[PDB]
Amino acid sequence: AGPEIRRAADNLEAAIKGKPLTDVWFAFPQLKTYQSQLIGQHVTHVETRGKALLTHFSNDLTLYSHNQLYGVWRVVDTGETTRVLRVKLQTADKTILLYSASDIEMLRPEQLTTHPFLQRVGPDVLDPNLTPEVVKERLLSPRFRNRQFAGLLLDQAFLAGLGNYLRVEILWQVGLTGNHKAKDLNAAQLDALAHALLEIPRFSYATRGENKHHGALFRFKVFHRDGEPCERCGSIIEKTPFYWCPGCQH
Numbered sequence: 001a002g003p004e005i006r007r008a009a010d011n012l013e014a015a016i017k018g019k020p021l022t023d024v025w026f027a028f029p030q031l032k033t034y035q036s037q038l039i040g041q042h043v044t045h046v047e048t049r050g051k052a053l054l055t056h057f058s059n060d061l062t063l064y065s066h067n068q069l070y071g072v073w074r075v076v077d078t079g080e081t082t083r084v085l086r087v088k089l090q091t092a093d094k095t096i097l098l099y100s101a102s103d104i105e106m107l108r109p110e111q112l113t114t115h116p117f118l119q120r121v122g123p124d125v126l127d128p129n130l131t132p133e134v135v136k137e138r139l140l141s142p143r144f145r146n147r148q149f150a151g152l153l154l155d156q157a158f159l160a161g162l163g164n165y166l167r168v169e170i171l172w173q174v175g176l177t178g179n180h181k182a183k184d185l186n187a188a189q190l191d192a193l194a195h196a197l198l199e200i201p202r203f204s205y206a207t208r209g210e211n212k213h214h215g216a217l218f219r220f221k222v223f224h225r226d227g228e229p230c231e232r233c234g235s236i237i238e239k240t241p242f243y244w245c246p247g248c249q250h
């Protein structure tokens, strides 16, 4: 439920990211008003949100889509099927076409945060478009800034692709217990956590074969390891399931 979806987003970027739109067409009448408005604009990036895609444009509009059962994005050359065409984004060389999907809507910035589906699933830590600056935004946003990291880091509504084993490594790297909230953190701390939320998860994926003959480049610090000393201070790691060093984490 992760490796894919990001694949569709990348196909669409490769095809038209940064390229000026020469034609924009939507099948739905309520979307017609954005056509001439997008001409000359370009997709800045395509964000993944569960099985949904967010196609951002340089004028701050964001096309949201959820293929659900039938929708399919096809790339072609500007010029080129029994399926009903719903969206057509055309540049000089490449053109992307959305077929069948019914869940298609245009969103203004302020609308992102309130969309029912989007409030339920956040950006993926593995998504290259996700930047530490964005993470800080969500952390600080009035919707999360008051949540303890213990559960926040286990809630997909905040960030997708965050397994418990990652939650404990991230917190140990910034020296924090699960009881803190982004509101009580100073700038330096907030940024530290922001990078940790991305780097650790990504560093974990880009590795791992085998452990029976070779040890992975990425090693756990407190996941499991309970009852073992901490590499930093030497205190014995504990478990609650949270894993932490009560010695250098507070």
Ligand SMILES: [Mg+2]
Residues within 6 Å of the ligand: 213, 214
């Ligand atoms: Mg080997």
Ligand SMILES: [Mg+2]
Residues within 6 Å of the ligand: 176, 177, 180, 250
């Ligand atoms: Mg503290």
Ligand SMILES: [Zn+2]
Residues within 6 Å of the ligand: 230, 231, 232, 233, 234, 235, 245, 246, 247, 248, 249
């Ligand atoms: Zn320690």
